[PDB]
């Protein structure tokens, strides 16, 4: 039973899965931060600082969690000698600042001791900024002004400046703690930091997670000199050149061979971001999209060429370094669906489904926007309802309200996807996951709006599983072979809905009208 390990250095936990050569998951284990390392005093794996904007995690908690999980696997009888390769994912954007002299500690690890004891003094910043941080608005405005504006920054790096993006965090550390910055020999993402621990040497950053920093020129796949210089001096030397995501960055350290029994030939394939790893785990291809439904709704897009915008995030693709992917984030998700259910259909998901069944595609021309909190994609707030004549109305009948919400949410996803260059193709598959993917009637609207089949997939471990798939891709030939050919053996998602006859005619006319009403609301602010 030869296998690969797929790791996930997440916000709240470190998780691992073991996947066999037939691409079956047969083992899973985790270490949860608040529960298993309570002495760090985190809540949800992080520290929200007094300003209410700075959000960090202790780097040595992440190292100690790796020690705990490897010892927990060993105590359970995990056979490490069967591990051919490993890869992993890191929560995106978060950064690690390695102190001058730290690589000497990494390359001289003794198997008699734990990682935490030996790496105790290796970090110039103890509290790492994570993806939840929103304390760098001044640095975002500075970076955009330095390179010719928000659109110029987006053309270049796939995104305008976002507070959590690494370049803005590095700029803030340079500005506020120049002594710690000047004593930093290396800056890693959570992904490349975790890979470095397994290598026992510094791992490079991959193209895909490297695209979440407002630093990488996504098309030429080199660091932007203009972005680097606007964030902090001598930054290129601290990052090192980025690499294709499907790169063998080295063999596992002899530390793991000797301490846990990994075979000496065990390969370490470059780590990537959790969203890129989930795209690999979901096995998206050209023409495909994934809709992750939850408190936030997240759209995962495959893109052959990028059309970066003031919304969304375009990254280099982790399973095909010549192409791209995108994320579009929607803040009004499952809480809006629950509120409409409670207000209009007696708090019943069965009546919610009946409302969709009892209304026609296109909802008689009744259109709605439902943003109780400020939306990200695009920046609108409020509930905005329009009747068949495009007149603004105060309310809808309950069944019309349910369909307006669901149709509107999915039409918004299509319009904003298409704004980044996405197009539905004949081969297109739609992957749906999360709470609302357990509602066939919701998935039917999604199929109708995109005029493409919808498949349901469990993604509780998608970043772990995607990481193990990427490790197998490395072993199967890497860049010499297509990722999709390696993972054809993995279990297929199940078909939940196909577009109803006439869907194409309904939404070809309604999508432009929804897009114009959205522009009307944005122009009135
Ligand atoms: O910040 C982002 C994406 O831009 C989150 O999805 C984190 O990657 C979660 O760990």
Other CB atoms closer than 10 Å to residue 501's CB: what's the count?
8
d(CA 227, CA 233) in angstroms, rounded, equals 11
Burial 354-368 (b: 16+ CB within 10 A, else e): ebbeebebbbeebbb
* 229 and 175 within one domain: yes
* 118 and 44 within one domain: yes
Q: State the residue for tokens 């083992």.
A: 27
* Residue range of the domain that includes 514: 283-457+493-525
* 146 and 3 within one domain: yes
Ligand 1 centroid distance, CA of 122 (Å): 26
CATH number at residue 115: 3.30.420.40
Q: What is the DSSP string of 450-509?
A: HTS-EEE---TTHHHHHHHHHHHHHHHTGGGS-HHHHGGGSPPPEEEE-PPTTHHHHHHH
Specify the DSSP element, H or E, that contains 272. strand 272-273
Strands 494-497 and 454-456: antiparallel
Q: Is 390 left (phi over 0), alpha (psi -120 to 50) or beta?
A: left
d(CA 165, CA 214) in angstroms, rounded, equals 6
* 204 and 185 within one domain: yes
Q: Tell me, using a 6 A CB cutoff, whether residue 274 lines ligand 1.
A: yes
* Contact of 132 with 56, CB cutoff 8 Å: no
Alpha helices in 200-273 (DSSP H): 207-210, 225-231, 235-239, 254-260
Q: Give a three-class secondary structure readout of 123-176.
A: ECCCEEECCCCCCCHHHHHHHHHHCCCHHHHHHHHCCCCCCCCHHHHHHHHHHH
Q: Provide the experimental method for this PDB entry.
A: X-ray
* 229 and 117 within one domain: yes
Resolution (A): 1.8
* 326 and 251 within one domain: no
* Contact of 319 with 302, CB cutoff 8 Å: no
* 376 and 420 within one domain: yes
Collapsed DSSP state (helix, strand, coil) of residue 184: strand
d(CA 240, CA 88) in angstroms, rounded, equals 20
Strands 127-129 and 55-58: antiparallel
Residue 313 CA: distances (Å) to CA of 55, 157, 349, 352, 442: 21, 9, 33, 32, 26
**Which residues pair with residue 248 across a beta bridge?**
269
* 169 and 159 within one domain: yes
Signed CA dihedral, 168, 376, 33, 137: sign only: positive
* 305 and 403 within one domain: yes
- Side-chain-side CA neighbours of residue 113 (13 Å): 12
Other CB atoms closer than 10 Å to residue 146's CB: what's the count?
17
Q: Tell me, using a 6 A CB cutoff, whether residue 209 lines ligand 1.
A: no
Alpha helices in 292-363 (DSSP H): 334-344, 349-357
Class of residue 394 by CB neighbours under 10 A (exposed 0-12, middle 13-18, buried 19+) = exposed
Class of residue 415 by CB neighbours under 10 A (exposed 0-12, middle 13-18, buried 19+) = middle
Burial 153-189 (b: 16+ CB within 10 A, else e): bbbbbbbbbbbbbbbbbbbbbbeeeeebbeebbbbbb
* 222 and 78 within one domain: yes
Signed CA dihedral, 63, 69, 74, 79: sign only: negative
Ligand 1 centroid distance, CA of 68 (Å): 25
Domain count, the chain: 2
d(CA 77, CA 27) in angstroms, rounded, equals 11
Q: Tell me, using a 6 A CB cutoff, whether residue 92 lines ligand 1.
A: yes
* 239 and 315 within one domain: no
302 annotated binding-site participant: no
Collapsed DSSP state (helix, strand, coil) of residue 249: strand
Q: Tell me, using a 6 A CB cutoff, whether residue 163 lines ligand 1.
A: no
* 316 and 393 within one domain: yes
């Amino acid at each position: 039973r030869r296998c690969c390990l797929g790791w996930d250095f997440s916000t709240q936990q470190v998780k691992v899965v073991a996947v066999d050569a037939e691409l079956n998951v047969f083992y899973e284990e985790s270490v949860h931060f608040d529960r298993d390392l309570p002495e760090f005093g985190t809540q949800g794996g992080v520290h929200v600082h007094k300003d209410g904007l700075t959000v960090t995690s202790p780097v040595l908690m992440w190292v100690q969690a790796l020690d705990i999980i490897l010892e927990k696997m060993k105590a359970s009888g995990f056979d490490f000698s069967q591990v051919l390769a490993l890869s992993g994912a890191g929560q995106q954007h978060g950064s690690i600042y390695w102190k001058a002299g730290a690589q000497q500690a990494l390359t001289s690890l003794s198997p008699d001791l734990r990682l935490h004891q030996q790496l105790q003094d290796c970090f110039s910043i103890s509290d790492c900024p994570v993806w939840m941080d929103s304390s760098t608005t001044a640095q975002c405005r500075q970076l955009e002004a330095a390179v010719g504006g928000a659109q110029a920054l987006s053309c270049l790096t796939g995104s305008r400046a976002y507070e959590r993006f690494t370049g803005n965090q590095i700029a803030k550390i340079y500005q506020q703690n120049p002594e710690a910055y000047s004593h930093t020999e290396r800056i890693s993402l959570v992904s490349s930091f975790a890979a470095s621990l397994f290598l026992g040497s510094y791992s490079p950053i991959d193209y895909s997670d490297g695209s979440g920093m407002n630093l990488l020129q996504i098309q030429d796949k080199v660091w932007s000199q203009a972005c680097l210089g606007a964030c902090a001096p001598h930054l290129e030397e601290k990052l090192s050149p980025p690499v294709p995501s499907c790169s063998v960055v080295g063999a596992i350290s002899s530390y793991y061979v000797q301490r846990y029994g990994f075979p000496p030939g065990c390969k370490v394939v470059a780590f990537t971001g959790d969203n890129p790893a989930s795209l690999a785990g979901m096995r998206l291809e050209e023409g495909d999209i994934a809709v992750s439904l939850g408190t936030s709704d997240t759209l995962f897009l495959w893109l052959q060429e990028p059309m970066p915008a003031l919304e969304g995030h375009i990254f280099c693709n982790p399973v095909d370094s010549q192409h791209y992917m995108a994320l579009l984030c929607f803040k009004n998700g499952s809480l809006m669906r629950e509120k409409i259910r409670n207000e209009s259909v007696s708090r019943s998901w069965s009546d919610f489904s009946k409302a969709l069944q009892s209304t026609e595609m296109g909802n008689g021309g009744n259109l709605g926007f439902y943003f109780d909190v400020m939306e990200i994609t695009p920046e609108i707030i409020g509930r905005h309802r329009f009747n068949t004549e495009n007149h603004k109305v105060a309310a809808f009948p309950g069944d019309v309200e349910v369909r307006a919400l669901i149709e509107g949410q999915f039409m918004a996803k299509r319009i904003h996807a298409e704004g980044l260059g996405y197009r539905v193709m004949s081969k297109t598959k739609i992957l749906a996951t999360g709470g609302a993917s357990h509602n066939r009637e919701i998935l039917q609207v999604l199929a109708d709006v995109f005029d493409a089949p919808v498949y349901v997939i469990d993604t509780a471990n998608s970043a772990c599983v995607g990481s193990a798939y990427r490790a197998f891709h490395g072993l199967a030939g890497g860049t010499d072979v297509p990722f999709s050919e390696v993972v054809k053996l993995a279990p297929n998602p199940r078909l939940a809905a196909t577009p109803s006859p006439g869907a194409s005619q309904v939404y070809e006319a309604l999508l432009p009208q929804y897009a114009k009403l959205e522009q009307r609301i944005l122009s009135q602010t």
